[PDB]
Homo-oligomer: A and B are copies of this chain.
């Protein structure tokens, strides 16, 4: 059954060298459960955990990775709603104290004692990884653990963002960055939730991919010069809600100018030092909200995975082996990324 040693990609100092080597198998605490992580997505947050450029101190030595779909192989003692052989998911937020005000309200991510898998907890870039039983995702049985792994971070983040834009069905939503990664998952979640997706991206074959996943209007930010005017025209007044899955400060600032009066602008990405300099007079005189959206609680996880489990959203991935890390890390530092990159822990 559970071995005494597994193979993980561990690094010992910030921005250091990633070693795919044998490490011990963790011991599930009385609240945690052990997960034979089958696959695990890789995303920019793993770069930011590697470098350590974010304020929160990173635990070291660290097995990064926070989008890990796997099988429950043995649990803790108080673990209640879980069985062995159940599929589980390691998300960004591994666990919280569940006694603080935020955990009680539902926003466990704002917990001061938040355990961030792959940042301050042994993440999912290993074969066997532990995850708090309360927060682990209840991936249904029979789902492709390869495809759901990117949905564990990008899908749950964009489901929360589209629920944070206070949109109603039929309302225009403008996904700034609407093809690739968070953008395409946001387009599919918005289309499944009822909204009328407008997309703002550019490059080769972006518009046909966008139309394929069910987008309504596509503003090519290369061909088109005035994006704000194009969005105000296509939406007939402005997008009812904007989802800024593009961390560039210019796009973020522009999204406050094509969002409808009384419309919401959700910021999803976490840049290093970006600022949302928005004209205060225009934001006041048009009653525009500029919301920020973090990972999303257990209800948003349940509902995003339930959208996935109906074939409504699909995550085209590229599966590689766990040993291909850190070629993915060094490839991601430059910008040679396309879609989502899943790693298989066995390979």
Contacts and interface: CB of A to CB of B under 8 A. Distances in A.
Nearest to A194: B194
B270 A280 contact: yes
Nearest to A303: B170
A280 B274 CA distance: 6
Taken together, the copies of this chain in the complex come to 4
A284 B262 contact: no
Contacts of A113: 80
A287 B266 CA distance: 10
A93 to B, nearest CB: 12
Interface string A82-104: 10000000000000011111101
Interface residues of A, number: 75
A242 B242 CA distance: 23
A109 B301 CA distance: 21
A284 B106 CA distance: 16
A272 B264 CA distance: 22
Nearest to A216: B310
Contacts of A192: 169-170, 194
A142 to B, nearest CB: 16
Interface string A294-311: 100111011100110010
A273 interface: yes
A290 interface: yes
Contacts of A99: 80-82, 133-134, 138
A284 B298 contact: no
B285 A294 contact: yes
A102 B302 CA distance: 11
A6 interface: no
Interface of A: 29-31, 54, 77-78, 80-82, 97-102, 104-107, 109-110, 113, 133-134, 138, 163-164, 168-170, 192-194, 237, 247, 249, 252, 261-262, 267-281, 283-294, 297-299, 301-303, 306-307, 310
